[PDB]
């Protein structure tokens, strides 16, 4: 899989934001940090939580 | 009525385009799965029972403490799985 | 790409700059300075005789006869973190249980008065709200409500889950945990 990013969207109505879930969203990246092409308002806690969850999932293998 | 209050508070002339629930998450803690349905709890009138015939500072500290507790629980479950394995 | 009207204020002298932090709206230069000043899903069927059993049991019996009911949701929700959180869930974070449990408690703290009631149950709630208003204390529905209605609560979530504009894998995870609770209550038939 290549995943050649999404090269950003202007500030018009095409740029749509909807933060709903922080654990197991499977948003394939393309996020931004806060204090159609779907992007989520991810934060430090959600990234660190899902990273810890994935590394605790994979350590059986 | 709750629908009357919703109509007289928001639906008349104020914040029609702006979402009131947009800044809801900045003060609510321990509610992440459903937040959109909590806002429109007064827009729908209640009804009787029926059945179909088919059938952020203190919040940061709180979530940090919750994360610490879950880390200790993860260590305990690691001990449990190495014991049962 | 400007927070204010698109064109530092371009086309002006250097003695007009301002870099304060307030709300920012573009609105296409306020609609081009006002036109140049106006030209100048359903739950699976596993052990669901309970819903048809208590559907006819609330017409005249209301499923509870004691006002200080000995059955509470606090203990049966506490057992979730001590029995199956360390057994069935994968190793990692217990967020999918603890966060949902806190959300369920906050939902149950205000779910009364908006559906989820029957006429005699409505009278029951009315009488407990007058009897709890004699000491101007908040009404906590944890100590005075049983765990029987929790199944009907998690059965009446799914058709209002899709009532709002929000994504589908949220519904998938919600029905996943609904399957988890029905698996949990498969054998726990005494509660």
Curated annotation (Swiss-Prot), chain A:
Location(s) in or outside the cell: Nucleus
Entry superkingdom: Eukaryota
General remark: Present with 486 molecules/cell in log phase SD medium.
Self-association and partners: Component of the RPD3C(S) complex composed of at least EAF3, RCO1, RPD3, SIN3, and UME1.
Functional summary from the UniProt entry: Catalytic component of the RPD3C(S) histone deacetylase complex responsible for the deacetylation of lysine residues on the N-terminal part of the core histones (H2A, H2B, H3 and H4). Histone deacetylation gives a tag for epigenetic repression and plays an important role in transcriptional regulation, cell cycle progression, DNA damage response, osmotic stress response and developmental events.
The protein, known as: Transcriptional regulatory protein RCO1
Organism: Saccharomyces cerevisiae (strain ATCC 204508 / S288c)
Lineage, top ranks: Eukaryota, Fungi, Dikarya, Ascomycota, Saccharomycotina
Gene name in the database record: RCO1
Swiss-Prot record, chain C:
Main location group: nucleus
Occurrences of domain MRG (ranges): 41-191
One Gene Ontology term of the molecular function aspect: histone reader activity
Signal peptide per UniProt: none
Keyword annotations from UniProtKB, A to Z: Chromatin regulator, DNA damage, DNA repair, Nucleus, Phosphoprotein, Transcription, Transcription regulation
Function: Component of the NuA4 histone acetyltransferase complex which is involved in transcriptional activation of selected genes principally by acetylation of nucleosomal histone H4 and H2A. The NuA4 complex is also involved in DNA repair.
PANTHER family linked to this entry: MORTALITY FACTOR 4-LIKE PROTEIN, MSL COMPLEX SUBUNIT 3
Any further remark recorded for this protein: Present with 1890 molecules/cell in log phase SD medium.
Name by which UniProt lists this protein: Chromatin modification-related protein EAF3
Highest classification ranks of the organism: Eukaryota, Fungi, Dikarya, Ascomycota, Saccharomycotina
